[PDB]
Symmetry: C3
Subunit: 345 residues, 3 copies
């Protein structure tokens, strides 16, 4: 009889995060979460390609859950009767029973309640894992998200100093494997089950057709760019449940980065690009110092520009010409430099 | 005239490890090992696909060798007359002569004796490297293993505390490149030499057809699952001589992980998934806290489930419901939750 | 009005590095550099395959720039009128305006001057990034290099001890995506623009046709091998602007390695193989202890041996038989060992 107070949590869709505290004086709680599996067709690129997705709570990625070390996490996983196949959930944050997967298999029309103790700090992947070849297929169909287990005293730099974020975003990256017809056009299917055989053939060759943030090419650009302001310290949680990624903030840095994502380790400082090993989450803090657009990418630039994996930040504030300035705008090349410039051919 | 006592070592087949000490009061020794190259056809998957393998001591991976810092490692490498081509050995643990490869080239019917000083602690790859295109081909045909050079005082956590394992397993991961015919069926060959040209064509495209532990899909499952017990601290050495991997213990963690595999560095704590850069070995300690089956995978789940790269641990002991419990078994979704659940579509 | 002394820098072609100091007593300077874009056909492999390359200063990689923390870096970027398209430059070392790219777009016949403050220590990638799909294309056509921002007191080991190199080399690794005809032969084009569509198709499948150091297979072998001597501490800077790499010095180690490349972090010690995440630079120090040839590779050995990614060091000095020796040259296998050797089949 676990005799701890209960605390409900209201999840929100990525890239935003439910309300939470960093440092807390609360004691351990039973933190109550609900995830509802949704099988649904989704648009994944700017040309309108559709996909038979499988998700937690209707999004790719599933929502970020936030708890503190020593909390107990009680998850009600629901599999609506309109879905077509069994699902479960594996928390990489949890200990035992294949992360929970061996205790959460549910058919359409069922729900189950799992409790796991948050004994390990960091950001962690969660994902569906029904068994055998269905494990990769459910994951790369969209059934993955992340959970953050904060120390009770919040984050620190590993050298005795507290670190605090003013804003948090969760960037879930998804590798997708979309069959093509003989002409090269992406194929559409009327159900996930119908897509499976052709999709497995693409999966086998290990080369995604799309690599996207928040479920679709362009999802976090334009009207949906991520907002920030000069002076704000922003935590960027990045997950990839199946395949490596190399995040980079174009025009910025990672001031403090937990590449492997685990807060019992000191973060690395001043990174250009970091590395999220497939099957994990990591996190980076950065304090914005300049206004403007920033692109946030995986720095395989082919994947970023051509397969979907670019987000934007729109940062308001005043430009700092000490950090960077255009000394001279574009102008003619002086003819007096001709010889000198021939040495650099 | 190196005047140190000699100590023979009797190698055993992976994933087990020859008898050794962690901390030792022995002084430096000439540690004597023998490796015998074996070219042999091997079954690599559950459908019975065969492969012309090339191995050290008849296994994929070659056996784990264990010594201590400051030992000298005297290796007799033997190339039986029934083999068909030259072989050698490169120790990433060693200094000079291309790791030993430039001193160990032997034809069928020859043996050679190499000695190297174990000046660097950690787990390290060893592999054949005859020269030019034969280097990748011999490696991805199976000619790679690992050596562990322990500190004399055993492992520590980088923060002044000793770490000791109760059990050790060596997981060698192998990327394989098996030609297919026009219909997609894997092709068989009567000798390694006959397989070479078609195999190089597959290698060139950098996408393995199989990714296996201990030489074959399913090798470390079923009857050959890895045994452990709740309370035991288990060291899991993982190597990959040619290609990256991202190990994960499903239902567990890496309590202490040397991702780059080198014991002069403190391990990272509490990892979900780690990263073995191709051409290296790493190691993870984990103390089992729950009984049951665990899967140990590379967390490209396509490779794990569909190309062969899953092992199992079978852990005996008592379940701990404080760490994880099924609060409610699968049940109907209440109709009273309909509206609420519509917000998660 | 930034009132600091100016210091010109004379760049040199990789793998060599312009003259510089490690520790310095100079105060902050405006360090003046010029890069001139060159579009040019280049030979990329030993069979004479040509490529429509795009470069900074005529080389792949672009030259290494070296400054100290707190310097201001004033770069004149020149786009000669004989080139065919716009170019710019993004410094991962810089803060704001997409690393400089949003302030440096120039047409053929133009030059621009950008200044950025070197507030972050480490080795960093710089690369062209005109916008959209041109970003990966310009990068994988050769438009990338690196900049090193040294602490003013030079490098240290993270444990209060200075580290100093006697020699520095910059190894830029380039993934190339060369179209083939129906027979498999590489195709030639009369301009970069003409190559683009076919090249993008290769890029999309994420598998390079070539992986090269210093712009071509064999560039840093034979007459162009890298020289060193026993006793010298050599810094090896490695960059990869678009794709992961796993450097390894065959016969050596990384004594001190900044895998993520950022000197505010302590280096790792005694690595066999390290990992350069695509979009970054890293660096390794190694003190040579044995003479001879060393190969320096990415340890995907297929890429190293078969797609171009092998360099050599030629190290002069005296062999140390204590570290490694051939105890017995190749000889017959004794018939007295037959039984014993049957246990290793
Ligand atoms: O609009 C952003 C911004 O809001 C300020 C309030 O004056 O801080 C607010 O937003 C940040 C970013 O979400 C949060 O960290 C604070 O909790 C919240 O009060 C502010 O500086 C400003 O102009
Ligand atoms: O059967 C495993 C198990 O054996 C015990 C002995 O009582 O420890 C033994 O095995 C472990 C795992 O190999 C080793 O570390 C010990 O050296 C060995 O004595 C035990 O707890 C038990 O039931
Ligand atoms: O020829 C290499 C070598 O040169 C010595 C000078 O006696 O050092 C010189 O070269 C190294 C490697 O570039 C530099 O670090 C020194 O600055 C330079 O003086 C030497 O030991 C030797 O035989
Ligand atoms: O990529 C193969 C080839 O297929 C075509 C259609 O025949 O386009 C497909 O692939 C493109 C790259 O992924 C997508 O942009 C497009 O949506 C898809 O139809 C050809 O245009 C292309 O050359
Ligand atoms: O994968 C191509 C295609 O080949 C076939 C046989 O024609 O199966 C081959 O590939 C499968 C996936 O690797 C293997 O399971 C099988 O052993 C091999 O024959 C087709 O079944 C498959 O669609
Ligand atoms: O690789 C496909 C096939 O193409 C051929 C020419 O028809 O060779 C091409 O590819 C080789 C491997 O990349 C290169 O060495 C060569 O330069 C290129 O023409 C065939 O020889 C090869 O089997
Ligand atoms: O003996 C079964 C106990 O374990 C259960 O968790 C799992 C269920 O799938 O049981 C084994 C552990 O031995 C599996 O590997 C899982 O870890 C518990 O819920 C429990 O009630 C059991 O007593
Ligand atoms: O001068 C040859 C000495 O080196 C030998 O090791 C190798 C042999 O292949 O020799 C060079 C080093 O210069 C190669 O690169 C290897 O390191 C030693 O065995 C030795 O006896 C020599 O004197
Ligand atoms: O308001 C424009 C200011 O920014 C300029 O740098 C860039 C130019 O492309 O401007 C925005 C920042 O808001 C872009 O994202 C870049 O960072 C400066 O040169 C400056 O003069 C401006 O005032
Ligand atoms: Cu599912
Ligand atoms: Cu998982
Ligand atoms: Cu061999
Ligand atoms: Cu090697
Ligand atoms: Cu350009
Ligand atoms: Cu970049």
């Amino acid at each position: 009889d676990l005799k701890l107070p209960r605390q409900r949590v209201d999840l929100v869709a990525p890239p935003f995060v439910h309300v939470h505290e960093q440092a807390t004086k609360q004691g351990p709680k039973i933190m109550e979460f609900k995830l509802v599996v949704q099988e649904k067709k989704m648009v994944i690129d700017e040309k309108g390609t559709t996909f038979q997705a499988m998700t937690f709570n209707g999004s790719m990625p599933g929502p970020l859950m936030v708890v503190h070390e020593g909390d107990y996490v009680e998850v009600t996983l629901v599999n609506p009767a309109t879905n077509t196949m069994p699902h479960n959930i594996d928390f990489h944050s949890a200990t035992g029973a294949l992360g929970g997967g061996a205790l959460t298999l549910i058919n359409p029309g069922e729900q189950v309640v799992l409790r796991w103790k948050a004994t390990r700090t960091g950001v962690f992947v969660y994902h569906c894992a029904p068994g055998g070849p269905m494990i990769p297929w459910h994951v790369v169909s969209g059934m993955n998200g992340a959970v953050m287990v904060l120390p009770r005293d919040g984050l620190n730099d590993g050298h005795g100093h507290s670190l605090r974020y003013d804003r948090i975003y969760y960037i879930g990256e998804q590798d997708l494997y979309v069959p093509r017809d003989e002409k090269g056009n992406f194929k559409s299917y009327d159900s996930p089950g119908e897509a499976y055989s052709d999709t497995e053939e693409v999966m086998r060759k290990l080369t995604p057709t799309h690599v996207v943030f928040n479920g679709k090419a362009g999802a976090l650009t334009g009207k949906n760019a991520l907002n920030a302001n000069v002076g704000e310290n922003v935590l960027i949680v990045h997950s990839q449940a199946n395949r490596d990624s190399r995040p980079h903030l174009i025009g910025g840095h990672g001031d403090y980065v937990w590449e492997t994502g685990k807060f019992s380790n000191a973060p690395e400082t001043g990174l250009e690009t970091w590395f999220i090993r497939g099957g994990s989450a990591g996190a980076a803090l950065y304090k914005f110092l300049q206004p403007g657009i920033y692109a946030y990418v995986t720095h395989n630039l082919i994947e970023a520009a051509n397969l979907g994996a670019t987000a934007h930040f729109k940062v308001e504030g005043k430009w700092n010409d000490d950090l960077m300035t255009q000394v001279k705008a574009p102008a003619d090349i002086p003819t007096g430099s001709t010889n000198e410039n021939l040495y650099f051919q």
